[PDB]
Amino acid sequence: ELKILEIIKEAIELGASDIHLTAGAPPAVRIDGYIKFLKDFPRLTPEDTQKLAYSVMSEKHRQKLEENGQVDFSFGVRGVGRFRANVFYQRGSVAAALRSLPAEIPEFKKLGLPDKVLELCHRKMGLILVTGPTGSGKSTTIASMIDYINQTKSYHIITIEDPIEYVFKHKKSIVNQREVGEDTKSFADALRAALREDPDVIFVGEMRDLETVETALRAAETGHLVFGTLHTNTAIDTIHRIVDIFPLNQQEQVRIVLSFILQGIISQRLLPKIGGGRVLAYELLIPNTAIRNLIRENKLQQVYSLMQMQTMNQTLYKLYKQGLITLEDAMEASPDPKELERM
Amino acid sequence: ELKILEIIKEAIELGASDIHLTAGAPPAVRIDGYIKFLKDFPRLTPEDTQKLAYSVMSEKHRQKLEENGQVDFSFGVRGVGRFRANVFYQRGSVAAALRSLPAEIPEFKKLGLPDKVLELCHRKMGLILVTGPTGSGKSTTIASMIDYINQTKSYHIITIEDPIEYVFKHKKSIVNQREVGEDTKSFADALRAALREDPDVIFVGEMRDLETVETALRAAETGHLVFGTLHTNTAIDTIHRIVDIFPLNQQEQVRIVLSFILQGIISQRLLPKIGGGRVLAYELLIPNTAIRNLIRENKLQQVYSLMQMQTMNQTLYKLYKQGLITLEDAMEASPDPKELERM
Ligand SMILES: Nc1ncnc2c1ncn2[C@@H]1O[C@H](COP(=O)(O)OP(=O)(O)O)[C@@H](O)[C@H]1O
Ligand SMILES: Nc1ncnc2c1ncn2[C@@H]1O[C@H](COP(=O)(O)OP(=O)(O)O)[C@@H](O)[C@H]1O
């Protein structure tokens, strides 16, 4: 009767985002943001949610659920696509929460970014940054850029992910994708090796460690175009954030580096549309003659003024000068009420 | 059908720099900077890239690919020459990236350095430094110097490398080459022993550690001519860099030492030629009566002024006073626009 290899069917048939298997309820499913218990066939599940859970768990996983009452892993079904699971000892039993992994990568056009971004991928070496609150298109924006490359250039692209969100088909180039925690054990002892694996483009899924940003930066300035992703929210704060987290025995030299190596910056926030709902706000900073020198001299604040590539407001407005984002959401996402309200 | 001992053939036949074996593609190859998939015979490789990988891996290697998802090692084929590999768990499989190791050492003449450099090797003890951005001839410049010696002197030369780039034929002297990570486990507990092995010339491939530079310096001032390689870019900054990284309870005495022991300095940058492409820029500092005393008194900046052996610009120009390096690259490599532009 009960088979996870089939529970996933009725879920993918309804278009669920997440499916949850607990102990007292019948397999559940998250649809349109709601939790609905699919009693369609399965009945209140027994503490043998451990049975279904194993019909997916290897051994380095099943034993891991024992050291600590939980495991975070990804597995693939030849049926539909790939899923992300997280089994854990819930209330003296076993509970699982399978998510879903993107089988297809979006056409950069569909994203929303300008036709300027597709030029960054065409650079030769530097530090392309994509920042925003968790849930703002970062992953997608990156996979569209890394995939645009994989299509038009003859490179060996190397990505260090946790977990591998999007996957890549070998096209005009050879892609190598290592999952931090399954293929290596860190972004460092993986980015460290990326250095000596002849990769043309490196990719760190997350850069919240000194040593990580340390190398992400040493690599960016050694011949490779690296893509990094901080959780900031604006341009000014980004470049600021990375230089600040460095001992002050050369916080300026770092400003110097971040000025010779910074290839681009694109912060994002996913606001709603009076359509289906998704549209994207953002701030794009493409260094020039002045800002380059500015950053180094740290005449920061003043650089924001030269920004006639596009402040977050010249954008928070541009979406409304048409009829998409309402005035309040153009504020509940606006990095500054003051800058706007004058439009 | 598939045999790494043969994949290397078709690669060396095309003159590739790197060859890459991934999982979805057919063995690939990096030619003229490009990634080309040699479908010549091999077909889309199966996850049995682990089979080819092992037809090269010993045991202290195959097991190492298990502790961490990667191994960095060198192996030799009696066919052509020696190669550098780096196998790693890529996307739940195994991926390899074999490079290539120089079978022959260049005639010092072909390098580009003046006829002054070949005199340093003839000194009796001191600290010969070769610095530059990774990719500037350091390895080659050194192997040409260490080999010029091996040819004209009756010495026991000892080199501590990681990895052994160039190899040496016993000529008028006996060469000993230890690979850090295979023969010993460090530049220190290897340079420490070099001290008591009666070597005439010592060689540290990399000196980015206190203890390392500590001994590289204690050895240089104990009777041996040692060759070191920092990643700096100019003379002034070099000697500066090494003294600064020393607790300030005698940063001057260190300046003192670096002034009695500094035998020479030659920073490099590989610029392009309107020919095939490679020509070399550089800054050469051969201490004298003044600079010796200068360094100690730390009247640094002023020493740069006595430099009528050759500033980086008197060079960045000398290449152009002929017709090789264009004016902009004579700047995109120039350690200072100001110093030049007056030529
Ligand atoms: N530019 C965009 N426009 C509309 N929807 C987007 C855009 N970027 C991402 N999304 C959608 O938002 C969701 C999550 O985006 P994602 O990048 O995976 O989160 P994160 O920013 O943490 O990496 C996905 O369902 C994705 O399709
Ligand atoms: N003086 C030079 N002139 C022209 N080409 C050079 C010179 N020195 C090195 N090269 C070439 O540049 C490449 C790398 O130089 P190498 O010294 O091995 O890198 P690194 O500076 O990191 O040690 C090699 O292919 C080498 O033949």
**Expt. technique:** X-ray
User: Closest ligand to B105 CA?
Assistant: 2
Cα A336 to Cα A234, A257, A264, A311, A320, distances in angstroms: 11, 29, 22, 11, 16
How many contacts does A have with B, using Cβ atoms within 8 A? 75
For chain A, how many residues are written? 343
Look at B30 and A156 and tell me if their CB atoms are within 8 Å. yes
Q: In A, which residues are within 8 Å of B92 by CB distance? A: 179, 182-183
Look at B90 and A154 and tell me if their CB atoms are within 8 Å. no
Domain B103-343: CATH architecture, name and number where available: 3-Layer(aba) Sandwich (3.40)
3-state secondary structure of A145: helix
- φ/ψ region of B89 (left if φ > 0, alpha if ψ in -120 to 50, else beta) reads beta
Beta strand segments in chain A, E: 18-21, 28-31, 34-37, 70-76, 82-88, 96-98, 126-131, 156-161, 174-179, 201-204, 225-228, 264-272, 278-284
d(CA B237, CA B239): 6
- Is residue A178 within 8 Å of residue A157, measured between CB atoms? no
d(CA B65, CA B199): 35
d(CA B335, CA B311): 10
Which residue's CA lies nearest to atom 10 of ligand 1? A137
- B15-33 residues labelled b (16+ CB within 10 A) or e (exposed): ebebbbbbbbbbbbbbbee
- What is the radius of gyration, based on Cα positions, of chain A? 23
Which two three-digit tokens encode residue A298? 């740290």
Resolution in A: 2.8
Cα A256 to Cα A33, A221, A237, B94, distances in angstroms: 46, 12, 16, 39
Which residue's CA lies nearest to atom 12 of ligand 2? B137
Q: In A, which residues are within 8 Å of B28 by CB distance? A: 156, 174
- Is the peptide bond prior to B163 cis by the omega test (within 30 degrees of 0)? yes
Which two three-digit tokens encode residue B112? 């580009």
Q: Which CATH number among 3.40.190.10, 2.30.30.230, 3.60.110.10, 3.30.450.90 corresponds to the domain B1-102?
A: 3.30.450.90
Q: Where are the domains of chain B?
A: 1-102, 103-343
Which residue's CA lies nearest to atom 16 of ligand 1? A137
User: Closest ligand to A161 CA?
Assistant: 1
The partner residue sitting opposite B134, judged by closest CB among A169, A177, A222, is A222
Nearest to B260 by CA among B210, B218, B221, B299: B221
Q: Which of B270, B273, B282, B315 to mutate to test the pocket of ligand 2 (most atoms within 8 A of CB)?
A: B270
